[PDB]
C-alpha cells in the first residue's frame, strides 16, 4: 500500500452538517410526536452531501452546473407537511470556488457562508435527501449519478460494492484513486447506523485516512473493516460502518 498524506487535510478541507453549511437546506416545519421541537431550524445537510461536497471542493469543480434536479420527500417524513417537492436549479449555477472556502470558523463573510450552503443544498437535493435533524440518503448509487449528470464529472465516476471484490482488489482500487490524487466517497452500515465519509490517504500499513464530515471530530487512520469512530456509540461499546460497504471512485472533472 503506498503512503499518501491526507489529501483533504493538505488542502484545509473540513466540512460539517450544521451551520454555516446548512443555511439553505429546508427549514423544519413540524414537531415529530414524542420528540422535542426542531421547528424553524434548518435540516442537517446529510453526511452524503457533506462527503460529496468535500470531494468537489478538492477539485474546485464544476464552475457551471449542468442539469436541474427535482424530487418529492417521502410522505413518512414527520418533519414536513406533505407533499413536499424540492428543486435545485443546478443548470443555472455558477459556483465561485474562491468563495466556497475549504473550511469555516465563523468569521467568514455571509457571501462565503452562502456559497458553501448553496453547494450543500444542491448536492443534497441531487441525492434525494430525506431531510431532518439528521438527514439520510441512499448514498453511493445517487452520488455517482449526480456527479456525472448534474455536476459534469467524468464518465469515470462509478459506484463499486465491497461484495464484488476480494479484499486485495478492493483496497487496490482505493489505492489507485489515492495515487491519482482522487479522494474516494465511501459508506457503510452497522450497529451505530449508516454513514458516508471520505477516504483520502493511506499509511502503508493497510490503514486509510478518513474524514468523517464532522468538522474534524474522529478523523484519523482506520482499517476498512473497522471503520469505527469513537465519537459514536452510547454506553461504552463498539460499532462501525463495516457492512454493506460501497464507494464512488473515478471522481475527477470531465
Amino acid at each position: 500500500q503506498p503512503v499518501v498524506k491526507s489529501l483533504l487535510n493538505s488542502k484545509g478541507i473540513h466540512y460539517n452538517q450544521g451551520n454555516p453549511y446548512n443555511l439553505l437546506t429546508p427549514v423544519i416545519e413540524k414537531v415529530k410526536p414524542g420528540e422535542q421541537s426542531f421547528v424553524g431550524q434548518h435540516a442537517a445537510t446529510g453526511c452524503v452531501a457533506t462527503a460529496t461536497a468535500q470531494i468537489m471542493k478538492y477539485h474546485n469543480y464544476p464552475n457551471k452546473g449542468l442539469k436541474d434536479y427535482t424530487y418529492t420527500l417521502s410522505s413518512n417524513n414527520p418533519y414536513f407537511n406533505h407533499p413536499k417537492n424540492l428543486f435545485a436549479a443546478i443548470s443555472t449555477r455558477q459556483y465561485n470556488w474562491n468563495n466556497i472556502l475549504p473550511t469555516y470558523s465563523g468569521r467568514e463573510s455571509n457571501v462565503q457562508k452562502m456559497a458553501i450552503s448553496e453547494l450543500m443544498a444542491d448536492v443534497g437535493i441531487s441525492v434525494d435527501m430525506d431531510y431532518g435533524p439528521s438527514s439520510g440518503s441512499a448514498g453511493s448509487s445517487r452520488v455517482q449519478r449526480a456527479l456525472k449528470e448534474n455536476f459534469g464529472y467524468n464518465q469515470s465516476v462509478h459506484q463499486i460494492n465491497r461484495s464484488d471484490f476480494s479484499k486485495q482488489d478492493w483496497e487496490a482500487q482505493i489505492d489507485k484513486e489515492l495515487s491519482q490524487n482522487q479522494p474516494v466517497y465511501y459508506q457503510g452500515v452497522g450497529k451505530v447506523g449508516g454513514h458516508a465519509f471520505v477516504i483520502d490517504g493511506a499509511d502503508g500499513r493497510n490503514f486509510y485516512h478518513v474524514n468523517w464530515g464532522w468538522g474534524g471530530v474522529s478523523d484519523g487512520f482506520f482499517r476498512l473493516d473497522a471503520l469505527n469512530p469513537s465519537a459514536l456509540g452510547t454506553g461504552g461499546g463498539a460499532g462501525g460502518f463495516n457492512g454493506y460497504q460501497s464507494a464512488v471512485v473515478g471522481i475527477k472533472p470531465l
Binding site: 442537517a44 452524503v48 434525494d128 439520510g136 440518503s137 441512499a138 459508506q187 452500515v189 458516508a196
Partner: peptide
Amino acid sequence: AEIX
C-alpha cells in the same frame, strides 16, 4: 435513505 439510511446513510446519514
